[PDB]
């Protein structure tokens, strides 16, 4: 990926990266919102 | 608060001042428009809506879109005036620093959000593919796998069109923005650090090595309470008349063969006396007046179309023989013929007795051959008639209405040519045509007592019941109750549960009372065990409560106590679950953890790192 | 916060102290007394003689309650004109007027009230707070017919449209309602009140205030409508949040922790409510239903036996080979209903009419196969019976049985299993007061009929016709042959598996929309569990495939799972045989829902938008039919 | 708010670009680092040698989440009487303590967090957060069976009444619980604490303080019960909103616009999970279903044939007039399983017993109906076979075949039909290792058996026998015959359609409780369409009816829909054959639903109150039985 | 004071002018304490 | 803050370090008065 002579990014295919799927870190973004209109007034 | 801002005109302060208050437009802070008062809840929700967008900020600013954040809280306006919905209610409500907004600016905001979410309609899919192609979440504990291996896998399975192939780093950082289990080194300093943002949101979604996670506890008891509420436990266990438009439910159709039935059990049939030695032949016209000749005889059967709760009938003849020495079913016709008369069908021997008659629809038959050698078989017929008491427009209370299905032809059939008194020997389907009437044992009714349906039915009467009968509605609502229990209850064979002890109490005071017959004392343990078995029997089959001669469910008091104790049993829960529930759930979770670890090990060995 | 206002008496205490706290009653805070409640709405009498003069405990009102009980007040105020036309509730309750803001120890128990010292907590008595909700709910009773009349004025002709804008002149639409609304409508009575209420709740309708010839918007719900309104690019935010939650709801029900388990699981945990099933013992292949015992045939043995019932009257019947019975043991109590209706059974000297048939239960050590004389039956009883009525059928000259309901329910605990060497069987055949010539009748039994078989136990399940306390979900995948399923029991683990894992299929289809032979985020876990199932070194001829091929296999396989979820259990299933296939897919459905972001499919949304305009086109076509028949001056 | 606390790098207030910020870290705010945390509840150890000294990221909690997590603690406090006996968690965690309020720029990206400064933002570290959620749900494990016991004490005898109030002396009921509580119940070891804990959560239970003989309410949930009680005129409040949204969940799931859409709609967005369907093959009129290609009746042509299976293992079978084969193309990959159990086939010279049958797949260019010889079959193979056993049936002197499950699943993705003229047909018939005589095998096929079908794909929608990826769901209204449906393929749109429409049907019934002819808010949608449509110049004589008629005529049609959904796709329905009315029917539902404001039917109120009091009448009846046979001293 | 049958009155259904009154409120007893 | 499967640890069971926690105490009724 490195498009520059000097790299100061995050080597995705580099070493030192960590992959530890844990229960405490169960992924989610924004499944649903309480957009009920009675509660929205 | 909530509503619309208000502005005063007159010098009145008293509540219920007649013309005190008038609406406040935008000008009272070109195009002057009214204003609305936002609430705290809506503000929280809409701000959370924005926070979805910045989950993908990197890919966005790479894609040169939406370079400045929406910032909902900014678009607001702050005033402290009268607020409410009705003037005569806002007049006694005056808040401080309420948030207000024009409808158009609010629309512009939500439209920006909506169109923004439109663009990422594919990038989200690609990220979902990335997180789902291999397990990036585990139920219990924690698993792990080297990053070179997993990355070498992704560059081996993601489709060539996937955006990750052309926009890697932003995809990676977005992944880490919601998955604490993936981290990226910071070669600037050389540090590894959680970057996931939904930290607290995932805590409730986690186990605790002794208990199940919170979310399924809360949600499962949610569904339990929802079912028991929607079942209307007051009505189902009532003790007085209830109008059918309340009691009734969407019903399911029924299957029948009229010839197979018992005439006395089925209250909705009349029959012409067997071996009466009377064979008369009568003629009826269609809706276009064409006269068809039909023959009747003893052994005929009909249906008493009065007191039916308007129905729809479709007949099916497939598989039946109806072959005859000089009367081949092939090429013939059958129809639904209505008979309207004052005379009971048991008293019909002549022609003019029949009163008014009509045929409503007819078909042609066909004859093929079957498994048995030299035997002919009729095709599938779907001849139907949907009944409504409005059309025939009953006037005289002594007027009677009978429906029959038999052969019809345009030539006078010799009676000796054929011996079937009808063709009701055929699988019949009967589907309710209305949803606001309810019957009982073939009798129409208007005011049922949901209690006294307990134990009032024999099994053959249950199979001979009409599709729109109160018994079936009772079954279905108690069925919802049965699930509610099953979601709640987990007590195994021969074990007391908070959903069986009402039966125990009803029995325990029943044993101590004074009535008909010898007394049979039992210790309390037997009573509890019995109640458990009976409740599990109800769970096995809802219809068994109404059954005559039931072991326990034959008692109305047992049923009432069960139904009512259900409500308290659910409502008094406190984020709790059963014991075997938790133990098995945790054990299974650990098993799945082992499975995931083994699989990711297969990956690590099948995709080496330098 | 919550809990109860706690007062301190310890007087030198900080935390966990033995006797620091006491309940705080309405004498401590006289403002929370029922003589000092503001009598707006007059719900408490002004006569001196009628007040209890007693004290009641006080309780704490939270953020959510005030923000909600106040929200209820608008339901009245949306219909405020009809109220004063009705002269009820001259003054709005204004809930925040019946509270008292205090600062003291607060909490459900004294232990955690003891460090929870807040400020300006709202406080109320059971009676004063009870009086409040009575005030509200009375008005709902008063508005009962108004609400029905209001709605039918709205749901008569289309007034909301999913997309864009339609139009209609006022004099047409007011004329339209004029003739078609019910005579007893409250609109006829008080028509201008019906006018004002719409504009409060519907922005489209607007009333020109005659004073200035002006017109503006009036709807109080402006913010909410936007959350329910489409943009021309995508579906509304409202249900995009809702159509996704139900998936997370359905998955929560299935409990993928269980259906992905690789360990024994107790039956009550795994069990689900069962459904009735149907069988025919006579045609049921003996080797497939491992619960049917059958005396062999062609031995020439033939005899009769006599067995009483609970009433003590004796009975006479026959026995011979070929006879099928059910092993009542280890069948997790069932209910048996057997309708002879539809069969012939006619014999050259024995018609079935008039006679009776019934259920027989047997008990012995000697297995049912060796039975060849009369003294090998041990214990016996006749538990039910019914008569036969034969009418005649289409099939010429041949009579048929009418509907029957021979019914019985096996219960172990009553039958009181004690001996490991026992054996219990159920038999149904012709029974009679007088004995029967063994050759006047020939049928080995009367099982040539239709039986219905419903479970009675709940938390106890069988697998392959045998009951077991523990069960492993994985040991079911791809082992029940199509035959073995049909010959199985109702209360079977497979059937218990088909339904419970079916709810996944509902969840997958409402979330994903993949067409034929293209991937999906739920098709992909399978797509991964293959490449590594393939790359390793093993038995057979290893078959290599591009990911473009590996993809489509799952993409089809996921479609097959939806249509018939019971395909996974089929032995030698095409793709879904592997447990790892099932595990990867089943686990991932949870993840694919947690990570959605208010997103619709690329295919889906356009169709909804395309649909929405057509309905808009339909409405305006309708709205002109009002114009052409109800013109305006 | 929400997000992550961002810090300014470099100088104070020098923030000008998104690249001039940085995520905070517990180093920056050391108060939120675990050597400082208030160890109340004793979670973190006290060894100075077991502590990380490693910093962790900081996260922001949301104001609507603290209210939720505080109440999580409230669950325990309903049991603290038992806890301190159990000697667990002596100090309630009081979540607020773990929080720390710092003010900074907060967001979920450095860009937007730049523009978003805030004051007094609570913060937490993920490790500390896990400790608190643990601290609660850990203790729940302890309460596992104390919870079960007391929930029994609540429900063994009626302690909640639907209406009014009921009474009985304590000293009586206690003797009963003493008489019935399981001997292993914790109550029998801890009566006093169990007594207190109940009185916490039940207003009626009221113990007496012996020190000065006072009895008072101890309910801490006096506000929750407020909205759970009924009034004297209407049902309770808590449920109507529960009841009213629950209909609104069915409608959105049913997606009203799609099922009332005039534009073309694709398959995978419309297709929904299917249902197995059952047919009989000989009995079907050949001119009804297109998927049945049958060689002309009474052909009387004899032609034997050799075929080879998937291993080439030869099988032999004959073809004759009346043989019927399935037109395998356009079948939307499907699963056929055939069930032959019951039928005889036993001819006079050729017994079924000990023979094999199987599916045969035919592939040729020549149309199948024109077949006369072996050069017209093209390519044909067997795909599965079974074995048949015989029994004896109700009709004496003829045997009967046992039950069979011949199966085969169809998928076009593997055959790869590449030329349209290439034609795919499937037959089921007898197969044997030896050629069979035509004079004996007079059966044209073996299609005289019940046959089951399940779709193996949820993206293919069939209409009128054929399959097309485009559907117009407006046209399916009233466009089928009863004959069409039973002949319809299992994945027919109208089958899927009524399933989508079923929820709409259900959602109505939850709302409406009207009787004959009774105009409802969900009836008048049709009434209007009848109003115009009567008046317009349609085909036929114009006939006029008054408004009351149009009400009831719509009223019958309404319920006629609710009673049964198949009437929307029925040729010549009373009204429903109209495409137009179905359109205006759905769009009525939403406005009806969204404009309800906390009320139910007038009939429902009068029924519920009279019904509910009967329980209160009944419950007292039960209760006074106890005081008699358990007398108060 | 308003002319229901007079001209000048605006009737114009917009999606953005969607209609609601008070469908439901969230009264879960757990969340009311 | 310790590495279970790391190095540096030592496993040297000895006579002088033979495990025991609390088998039994001397709680005679006569002894306790
Ligand atoms: C869009 C709904 C508009 C409804 C306006 C109020 C109803 C009109 C009143 C009907 C009676 C008119 C009497 C005249 O005179
Ligand atoms: C309404 C139930 C309140 C709590 C009842 C507690 C029941 C205790 C059963 C008897 C305990 C005996 C202990 C001594 O002896
Ligand atoms: C660096 O040397 C540029 C080329 C390597 C970039 C990594 C491979 C490209 C795709 C990102 C990760 C691979 C899986 C998508």
Author numbering:
A (entry chain A): 2 to 42
B (entry chain a): 43 to 71, 95 to 675
C (entry chain c), D (entry chain b): 43 to 675
E (entry chain C), F (entry chain D): 10 to 42
The paper states:
Mammalian reovirus (MRV) is the prototypical member of genus Orthoreovirus of family Reoviridae. The ISVP transcribes its ten genomic segments, adds a methylated guanosine cap to the 5′ end of each mRNA transcript, and releases the capped mRNA from the turrets at the capsid vertices.
Notably, the N-myristoyl group of the first type is kept within each respective μ1’s hydrophobic pocket, a helix-loop-helix motif (residue M212–R243). In contrast, the N-myristoyl group of the second type is exposed and extended to interact with λ2. The bond is formed via complementarity between Loop 51–61 of one μ1 trimer and Loop 72–96 of its neighboring μ1 trimer. Five λ2 subunits form a pentameric turret with an axial channel. In our structure of ISVP, loop 581–588 of λ2 bends towards the 5-fold axis (green in Fig. 7d, e) to avoid steric clash with N-myristoyl fragments of μ1, unlike the unbent loop (gray structures in Fig. 7d, e) in the crystal structure of the core, in which μ1 is absent.
